[PDB]
Design a protein around this ligand. Sequence first.
Ligand code: NA
Length: 446
Amino acid sequence: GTITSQDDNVVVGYWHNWCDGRGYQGGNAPCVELKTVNPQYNVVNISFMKVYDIAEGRIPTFKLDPTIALSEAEFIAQIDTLNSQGRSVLIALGGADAHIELTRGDEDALAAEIIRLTDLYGFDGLDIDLEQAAITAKDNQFVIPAALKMVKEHYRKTGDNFMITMAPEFPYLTANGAYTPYLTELDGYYDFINPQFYNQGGDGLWIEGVGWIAQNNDALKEEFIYYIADSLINGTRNYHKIPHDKLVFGLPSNIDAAATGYIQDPQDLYKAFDRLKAQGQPLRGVMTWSVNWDMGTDAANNSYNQQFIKDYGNFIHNQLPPVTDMTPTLSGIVDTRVELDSHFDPLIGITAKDYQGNDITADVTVSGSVNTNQVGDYLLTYSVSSDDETTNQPRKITVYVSDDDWQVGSTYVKDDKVTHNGATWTAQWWTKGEEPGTTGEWGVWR
Ligand code: NA
């Protein structure tokens, strides 16, 4: 099939390529045919592309579990069905026990395999759902991005939009965080991120006024959803900036489906979306583990009568067409220290991308100066415009006084370099209280 890109808000559902999956409270996730997946999940993610046995090498692949009771011809046509209905089928790279340990160079193999599997099942793109171990493992943080980047271009030539999604667990999203490589490298290439806001129980964030909100807390679930969201969509509270148009809220479908992080009351999520909506940053949809557990049954053989999707689906669909955050991006801006009378180039280190990936570093302006000559703290503001939008972002420069600065009492020796009234005077012999500049043409100081 051809690549069907999802372009409106999305509900996202993982599909088990296994049967009788056991839950955290002894439920069952029966397998199910694609075409049984509730039609309001307009993004189904086939789970999982991995390495089935090491004797096929490091490059992972996908094979339908015989037990599922589906011909690969059927499977393929069920995808063509969803595709035609406007929905989208994705291959999720990873899961547990995926043994995904790529070394540098494997890019081309991964890419080619991706492209093969895609052209065969009519998949519409990939979901990076690496387990913990596999985020850092060997060269993953290089290979995987590299691969997909190539893949995306392959399809860009034809005119097709290979969908890229990721599914980091939220703690990994803290700027300077494992997934930074992925997000940074794949910027403009990824369609939208669907973090897992589950299974990191105690983890969370501190909000001024509210205190310590954690994912394991169901009294403050409204907060959690609202705050982590706001942080991510704004790059605040030590979190990477995922645009709002590209953020999707990853949730258990129910209690069997995860240890922690299932929302008891939807209102919580509803309010948070209306909140984030109110502030001008509506989210792109929700995501769950999994349609199978939603279609599943609990430890009492009671059906979870596909609740989540009932909970969330009109909710999300009745929302409004996404609007693209074409703001550009400014990386490099980190508050720095500079030595008195030292040299400082503002535009060193600074890069700027647009919304689609393109580097606009050139078009970066700077407002402010940093008078190294005088001690103090100086405030630059960087600014770049593209696609009719501007991003501005402050930067603080503190001027340190340094050892070298000439002190009266300080005994300097021959060849010593000090500083005074804006200069780096050299001594020519022992000295102790001769102000550089009061000497002469042939003075202690030079
Ligand atoms: Na397709």
